[PDB]
Symmetry: C6
RNA sequence: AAAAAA
RNA sequence: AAAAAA
RNA sequence: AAAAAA
């Protein structure tokens, strides 16, 4: 089992806007387009690839 | 045996408010809803997913 | 399936200029010549080898 | 075999006060209460869980 | 296969002066003397051991 | 073959004073008493345990 | 120990 | 989101 | 390349 995947899959399904905060404190904003074991694709004006190892937190702008 | 799971599990069941300190010094506050091998679910205004690799310390508010 | 390889591979073939952001905020600019499991080859004035573990994000200049 | 465990077990056994310095330079102080493969429990006024991956050094306040 | 090793082996063979930038932005300069799976030996006035996990980029002072 | 063990082992036996630089720039000074897969034992006023994952470079004072 | 420098 | 504090 | 911002 897991908990990371159902959490991310939910923000993906529901198109909820998230804030992904990186290990350096930088805050990226957009929507989970998709993800795998090591990365998350984050869509704003463009899709960008975010390595998971650089992520602190994934915060939804509203509950799930 | 494990030490991480029992400690985290006790804060979970006992609804103990914790400060989670990140590798960059930032202090997150809330309660542990659940956790898995790589992430912890922290509830305050909302539930954010916190990656364990970004965590320094998990500090209880009261002794457990 | 993978998500990291197809995304990186598309920027490679389509000669798409990318910004690579490091875990320390520094933005590297250039094009992806190639990559493997642990590193990415980035071309600008020269080819530098960038370790994936030092990468936060890989941001395309145009959508892909 | 190992060397990390006999070292920590000694500071635990002997109740020696230690300084654990984190990767961000922060200095935590207390006594090793216990540890496993990934974390160390550090007792001061409260016990807190310190992930090993966030640790630079474990310095005793006196030789072992 | 790989791509990291042929790249480093080339800078080693050809005695090309490199700049190795660390995850903290510090820039070390010298020549790859040798390397393994986890470290690179960098020769200037003295040889020093650089852990790979602390490296951002390996930049040649001229193309390969 | 390994490269890390022979280099570290030579500084150990030859009692060579080394500077150990952390991923945060801090320079530790002393001598290598011993080391294992994950940690290095550094002696100055006392022996501190230094986690390898927190190390950038190990720099000898004299050539070895 | 900056609830966090797109 | 300092093409980068030997 | 801050022997180290509980």
């Amino acid at each position: 089992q897991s908990l990371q995947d159902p959490f991310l899959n939910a923000l993906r399904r529901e198109r909820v806007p998230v804030s992904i905060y990186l290990v350096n404190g930088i805050k990226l904003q957009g929507q989970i387009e998709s993800f795998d074991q090591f990365v998350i694709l984050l869509k704003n004006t463009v899709s960008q690839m975010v390595y998971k190892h650089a992520i602190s937190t994934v915060v939804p702008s509203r509950p799930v």
